[PDB]
Write a protein that binds this ligand. Structure first.
Ligand SMILES: Cc1cc(C)n(-c2ccc(CC(=O)Nc3noc4c3CCCC4)cc2)n1
Length: 307
């Protein structure tokens, strides 16, 4: 039978519910605010994309986050995977308070941008999503991640005129053919780096259990370990640390962070010398204003900066 992208209108039988205030999560602010690049609004206010090799459509009211899956409706198993994805364990309201009480600029911005939170992403997925492109702009990375998924990850399902592949496994990326293929897709020289990091993870660190150990490790160790990988520098490593390795204190520094720091906070390098040195300084700067969940505080201001 031909499968359509579902709505709350087309087939109510096929939806479960997670009790979730629109104060703790706005999907229109999280799913395409530069954290994950695999979610798409196919029909109005309905978010469809791949998660852990299963296709989901998501939507919400003021009370309830509504979920449907494409493999019948979601289990406890499958709803516990969304609960940990959105990190609903953590009270965002108790962060938007603590960030308010130290940051007057937050309190003004955070009126209009409620319910921005971090996703807990898959380490492999996140790592390769950030090394396949410049990270110039959301649209660039979103297209590259799709091309990458279309050619290296297994076909999963058709929905309307759209075919969903899963995120590539390390073996598909690590093969002796990977680069020449990846360069078809437009990755340029970053095709070298995609292969070599996959090769490195499988054949020198024990495969993805390595990244799970970094998730267990403290921030500094995982960062450092992430930078030994080809194609990974300081910004990408903090992205991964923040977004996949449970390091809320990570503050990935790039030219938008600089722009926000300077215009909105009055910040300049105390070194008096953008550089490796000064960027490290700016991330120290933000950790010390915002606290242990500093990245999550960045997330809000990034949503606010895209509008
Ligand atoms: C026009 C414009 C304005 C902005 C802020 N971007 C933009 C945003 C996002 C990305 C991808 C990226 O790098 N995301 C992140 N890096 O650190 C963080 C994130 C996401 C969550 C909070 C920590 C690229 C561009 N584009």
């Amino acid at each position: 039978s031909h499968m359509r992208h579902r709505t709350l209108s087309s087939s109510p039988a096929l939806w479960a519910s997670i009790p979730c205030p629109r104060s703790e999560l706005r999907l229109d602010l999280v799913l395409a605010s530069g954290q994950s690049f695999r979610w798409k609004e196919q029909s109005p206010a309905h978010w469809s994309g791949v998660l852990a090799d299963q296709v989901w459509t998501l939507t919400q009211t003021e009370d309830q986050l509504y979920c449907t899956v494409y493999r019948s409706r979601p289990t406890l198993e499958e709803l516990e995977t969304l609960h940990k994805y959105f990190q609903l364990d953590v009270s965002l309201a108790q962060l938007y308070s603590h960030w308010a009480s130290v940051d007057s600029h937050f309190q003004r911005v955070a009126q209009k941008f409620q319910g921005v939170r971090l996703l807990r992403q898959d380490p492999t997925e996140c790592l390769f999503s950030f090394i396949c492109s410049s990270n110039n702009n959301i649209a660039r990375i979103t297209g590259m991640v799709e091309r990458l998924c279309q050619a290296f990850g297994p076909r999963l399902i058709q929905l309307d005129d759209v075919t969903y592949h899963g995120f590539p496994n390390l073996h598909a990326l690590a093969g002796p053919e990977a680069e020449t293929h990846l360069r078809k897709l437009g990755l340029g020289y970053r095709a070298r780096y995609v292969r070599a990091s996959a090769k490195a993870i499988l054949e020198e660190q024990g495969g993805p259990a390595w990244l799970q150990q970094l998730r267990v490790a403290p921030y500094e160790e995982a960062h450092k370990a992430l930078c030994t990988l080809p194609g990974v520098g300081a910004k990408v490593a903090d992205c991964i640390c923040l977004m996949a390795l449970d390091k809320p204190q990570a503050v990935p520094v790039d030219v938008h962070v600089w722009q926000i720091a300077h215009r909105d906070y009055g910040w300049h390098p105390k070194t008096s010398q953008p550089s490796p040195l000064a960027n490290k300084e700016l991330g120290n700067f933000f950790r010390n204003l915002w606290g242990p969940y500093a990245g999550w505080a960045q997330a809000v201001l990034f949503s606010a900066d895209l509008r």
